[PDB]
Design a protein around this nucleic acid. Sequence first.
RNA 1: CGACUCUUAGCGGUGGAUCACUCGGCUCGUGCGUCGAUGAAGAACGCAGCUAGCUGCGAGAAUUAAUGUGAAUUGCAGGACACAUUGAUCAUCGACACUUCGAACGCACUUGCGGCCCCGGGUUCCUCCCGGGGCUACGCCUGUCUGAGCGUCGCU
RNA 2: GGUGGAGCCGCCGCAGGUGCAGAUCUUGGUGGUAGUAGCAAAUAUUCAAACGAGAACUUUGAAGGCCGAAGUGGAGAAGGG
RNA 3: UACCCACCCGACCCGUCUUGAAACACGGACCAAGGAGUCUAACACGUGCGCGAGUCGGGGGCUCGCACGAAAGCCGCCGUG
RNA 4: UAAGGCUAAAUACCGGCACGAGACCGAUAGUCAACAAGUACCGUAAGGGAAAGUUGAAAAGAACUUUGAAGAGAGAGUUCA
RNA 5: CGCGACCUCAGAUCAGACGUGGCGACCCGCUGAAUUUAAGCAUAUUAGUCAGCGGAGGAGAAGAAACUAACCAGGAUUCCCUCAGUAACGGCGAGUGAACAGGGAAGAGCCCAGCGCCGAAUCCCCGCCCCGCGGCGGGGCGCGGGACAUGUGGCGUACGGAA
Lengths: 53, 158, 122, 86, 50, 135, 134, 59
Amino acid sequence: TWRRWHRRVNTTQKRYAICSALAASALPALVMSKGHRIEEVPELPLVVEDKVE
Amino acid sequence: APSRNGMILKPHFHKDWQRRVATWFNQPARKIRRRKARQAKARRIAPRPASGPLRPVVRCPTVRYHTKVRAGRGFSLEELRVAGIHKKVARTIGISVDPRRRNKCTESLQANVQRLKEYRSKLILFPRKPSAPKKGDSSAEELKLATQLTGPVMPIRN
Amino acid sequence: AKIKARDLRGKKKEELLKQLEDLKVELSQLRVAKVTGGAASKLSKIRVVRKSIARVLTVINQTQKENLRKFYKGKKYKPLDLRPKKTRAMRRRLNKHEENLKTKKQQRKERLYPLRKFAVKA
Amino acid sequence: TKGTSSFGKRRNKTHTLCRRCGSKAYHLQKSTCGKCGYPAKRKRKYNWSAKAKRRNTTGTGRMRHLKIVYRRFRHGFREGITPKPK
Amino acid sequence: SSHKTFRIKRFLAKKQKQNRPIPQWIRMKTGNKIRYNSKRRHWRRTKLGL
Amino acid sequence: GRKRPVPKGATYGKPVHHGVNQLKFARSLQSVAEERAGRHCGALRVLNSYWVGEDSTYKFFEVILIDPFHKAIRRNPDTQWITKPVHKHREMRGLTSAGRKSRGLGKGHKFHHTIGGSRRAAWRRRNTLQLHRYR
Amino acid sequence: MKFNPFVTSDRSKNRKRHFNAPSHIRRKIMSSPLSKELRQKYNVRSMPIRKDDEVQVVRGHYKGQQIGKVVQVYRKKYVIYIERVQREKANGTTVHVGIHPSKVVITRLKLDKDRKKILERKAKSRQVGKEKGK
Amino acid sequence: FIVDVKANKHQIKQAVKKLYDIDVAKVNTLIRPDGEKKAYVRLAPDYDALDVANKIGII
RNA sequence: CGACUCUUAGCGGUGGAUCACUCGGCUCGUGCGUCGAUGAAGAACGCAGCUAGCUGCGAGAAUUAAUGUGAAUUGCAGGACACAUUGAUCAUCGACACUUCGAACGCACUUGCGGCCCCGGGUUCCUCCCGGGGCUACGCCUGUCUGAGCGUCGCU
RNA sequence: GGUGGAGCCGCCGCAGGUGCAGAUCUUGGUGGUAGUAGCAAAUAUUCAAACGAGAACUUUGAAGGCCGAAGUGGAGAAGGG
RNA sequence: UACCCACCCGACCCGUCUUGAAACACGGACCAAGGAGUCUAACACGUGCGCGAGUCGGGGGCUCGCACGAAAGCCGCCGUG
RNA sequence: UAAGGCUAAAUACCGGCACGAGACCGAUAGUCAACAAGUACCGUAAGGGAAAGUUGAAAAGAACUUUGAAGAGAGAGUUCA
RNA sequence: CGCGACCUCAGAUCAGACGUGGCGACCCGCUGAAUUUAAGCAUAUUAGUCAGCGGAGGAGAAGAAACUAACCAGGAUUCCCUCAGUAACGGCGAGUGAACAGGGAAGAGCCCAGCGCCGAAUCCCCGCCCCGCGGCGGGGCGCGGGACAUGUGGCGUACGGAA
Ligand SMILES: [Mg+2]
Ligand SMILES: [Mg+2]
Ligand SMILES: [Mg+2]
Ligand SMILES: [Mg+2]
Ligand SMILES: [Mg+2]
Ligand SMILES: [Mg+2]
Ligand SMILES: [Mg+2]
Ligand SMILES: [Mg+2]
Ligand SMILES: [Mg+2]
Ligand SMILES: [Mg+2]
Ligand SMILES: [Mg+2]
Ligand SMILES: [Mg+2]
Ligand SMILES: [Mg+2]
Ligand SMILES: [Mg+2]
Ligand SMILES: [Mg+2]
Ligand SMILES: [Mg+2]
Ligand SMILES: [Mg+2]
Ligand SMILES: [Mg+2]
Ligand SMILES: [Mg+2]
Ligand SMILES: [Mg+2]
Ligand SMILES: [Mg+2]
Ligand SMILES: [Mg+2]
Ligand SMILES: [Mg+2]
Ligand SMILES: [Mg+2]
Ligand SMILES: [Mg+2]
Ligand SMILES: [Mg+2]
Ligand SMILES: [Mg+2]
Ligand SMILES: [Mg+2]
Ligand SMILES: [Mg+2]
Ligand SMILES: [Mg+2]
């Protein structure tokens, strides 16, 4: 039971992990290349009105 | 059998660590068990500083630690006859009484008295009954607040 | 034709004992019939009758005890059957005077120094 | 002759049925059982082989007082009250 | 033994009744796993709880 | 004193462990007295004890016991704290005046073992790895 | 998604709570839908099936439009036993064949004191949810 | 008769008497290997078994 | 082509791997924290219309009354009932019950022996005898009654 | 290709109780041996009929035999149930 | 390439301990299935990534009935060390 | 400031009841125990202590003819099989 | 050669209570090895651990300092981090091996005896009523008992308290 199940990351490491994930949430290359079926989408960092909330 | 440069190591596992190992997969459910107390206690004592009673400015002891200051246990006795607060009343008014502190200096005495003087002034004594007489603070200074003090009452910053 | 607890509840004690003793007899014969072939028809009844004896005897001890716990209701010194059977620890818990009792010293403190209500910083 | 020829004259009994245990371990001579140990007021349970403990503990039997305790608690231990009639 | 006690007699009475087969009708019950008794004894092999 | 209860000398094993005459009970004799009086009157709940007299061969410990279930005790508070089921035989656990001295508690630079709850629950804490979740 | 912890979602645990549920519950389980006519008339989607209720098979080998009446209910085999729903055995002795409620549709409820009040109370709950959503 | 196993003869006698408004010369009990207590009850000479069989329904 | 044998193949078995399922485990969390002389835990024996086992129950024995629930129940019978009805069944359970051992309690454990109270028959307390009900185990607390003591006195 | 009857795989990652010929390794199964060893302590059987689908083996009769009252005779204990 | 067969040359039975095994050393009838370097702490070097005279991590706090959650996020905490 | 004494709270929980989940095991694994499991059986006794899951979707589980003393077959029948 | 108080001590199937077994992870007293480790070995260690034994509860123990400190001081308990694998112990070797300060969870404080004050201000058990009765309790009324003067109630308890 006392196997070291869980693990560890530096805050900074795992903040600029989010950066790199977000920065590539633009760039239709990478996003499409996950099979994310974005072809008829108007623009990629896709912003929407705040009516949606 | 050592080989070529390490430390010595007296790891202490000759006893029986195995039986008495505490793993901590409570940790997060405990976090929450706790949450619900902090939470519940506050909703129960509705208007009352959630953190707890008022607690004195106090200096850390041993020589290294000198320059720091703390929430102490409770305000001294000598401290109160001075602020004009009866020790058994203080305990009902959310004023923390240690009665076990040797007060040695006028510096840290008046420093710590000013906290009581401060407290009195920004304290809304919510009256015994609704139709109640003296010392309870007026229906204006009463309507204005339902305000629990989140965080430590009059926090002591160095 | 079931001898329901409807129709017994409000009846005289001595009457029930006759109807019990009617059934008891009748049961004894159904055991005989069991041994002497009998018939499927009879070999069911033997259950209905058994149970109907309960349906009866219940009502007897029900209505006895209902009655019996009405003498000593009010009297102090009453028997074990009727004394309230919660749990040993539980019947040796303190009385419900004997914790909400307070020493007079303490009452005197509860009067002079009760806990106000108050929020602060305002 | 300590085998076969002695697995022979084995007529007479040491052990018999205990009136507390149920087991076949009354020593007739000693008149102590030696599964529970009888005249001994207390059971001989024994921290000792946990195997032989878990063969007869609260659970294994019927629990015919007990099983209806935990019933009564669940719901709250009340008595002398009957659900509202029709 | 021919000199028994009652306690010993009440045993064997019980044990004796525990040998009978399985009622055939059991085997038609909706959800069986039961085909033959499987706790049967024979005086000669398996020698009681005594 | 106390005498290792073994057939003859026969304290089998190593020559440290190899004694029998000269060695002492952990508890005190007073606490044994309390033990045995509270163990007679199993109904009664032990309080505490004086000394009355001694001899070369015995000590005479006179012991204060209470009925938890004199109404003269349930009904008066202060006293009604023995009644409560926690205190069932205080003297067997070592909660008596005398009985506690053996456990070796207090505050300070000597009551360091027993700095958890008690002698045992000191080391329960010290001879454990706090192996955290998250390491 | 479910949410309420204090409910299960476990492949096994409610596979279990099946062929161990008491006859009490099996009623609710052994329910079939009502035909459009009744579903209109009454404002109730589905009902617990009952011994003498008239029923149309919808799925199965011998689906059809023939309104047979229910005969009995294995709540043990946990399956119903209908009228011309039957097969001939090797000896000619006709035996009915099992069908669920769930694979059947009610075409005429057999009404009662106790069954009416359900139909009221289900239809009242339906409309209270629609009036609450309104 | 098969009889309840805690029965004595003066109980079996004041039973059989009470019921088949009979009277009993002597009772004579054994315990069948099975635990069932038998008790075969001689009825006084004035009084017949072969009739009181048909009353109690046996035969 | 003779028979046996070996190899390989075509099929027949034997065995029970593999795979695929899974009302069981295992692990980890949360809530609560459930005994008893009013007589536990534990055992014995018995109990179903057809029942050996498990399970459920206790001479009211595959349960008791009640409240929901609300038509089944079922291997086969059999059934009431009136399914316009505590109304089948199930869950709940709160109404009543609790065979024998057991801390097991009158004394012992043979299953025998008693004591003391009551009520049937017997008697007509005449005593058994036969029937029925209640007590009778050890420790100790508060109280009561009866006492003991050349213990300490008092009055005679 | 056949049979089988319910689920499965490819890449990029992450995770293992991870790959058997061996340990007089563990469990279950199966051979050769082999249709092999063997069914040898108390001298003893034979005929006829019955019954039976089926008889050396059951039964009845007849005949030959043994135990041979310190018994293979007739009753019990403990044990057995 | 694989099955049988045919020929010509080659050719000792594996595993293991072993200076040396085909061993007149030991294990090993055959087959299925199971089966042996695992986890944790502590070091140490090597390397990967973050930040850099800092840097962290808890333990604590603040933000959940978790569906995902016993996660993630955030804290003069952030430094009491 | 001992020689007298009480006490919530955090704090512990492989036993109980009641639940929720999983990078889990998946019937020689997983607990001894998926089932009559602490069962069968062994030992006088302390104690020891197993094996054993799967028809199909539905028993629709071969009616009937026929061979066979009977076990078994051949047709036939049922079945998507 | 009486009767009567008390003191000690018996007997009661007396009136009313109660104790005893089990469960046993966690909880508390005690007791208590040897494998093992040290390349042996007895010192040491395993390890105050297992068995043994005793004892409790919904948690257990402890707890309002005969403490900490050496500061310019703090301030019941327990718990987590931390100190810190450190001060020391040891054929100073195998191992062993805590504490003080800080931060944080939580955080509540209190009661006796004595000195004295106060017509025992007390307490227990009966009887009659009034309410209350499925955790037996209030209210009253009774020359109905009894403890208690070798001492029962209130204030009071050291942070002062009494007057
Ligand atoms: Mg706080
Ligand atoms: Mg006081
Ligand atoms: Mg034999
Ligand atoms: Mg298998
Ligand atoms: Mg398999
Ligand atoms: Mg005298
Ligand atoms: Mg794995
Ligand atoms: Mg393998
Ligand atoms: Mg001869
Ligand atoms: Mg004979
Ligand atoms: Mg070598
Ligand atoms: Mg050679
Ligand atoms: Mg070798
Ligand atoms: Mg103290
Ligand atoms: Mg205490
Ligand atoms: Mg406590
Ligand atoms: Mg298997
Ligand atoms: Mg297995
Ligand atoms: Mg298979
Ligand atoms: Mg298989
Ligand atoms: Mg097929
Ligand atoms: Mg106990
Ligand atoms: Mg060595
Ligand atoms: Mg050594
Ligand atoms: Mg050695
Ligand atoms: Mg040593
Ligand atoms: Mg030591
Ligand atoms: Mg040590
Ligand atoms: Mg132990
Ligand atoms: Mg401290």
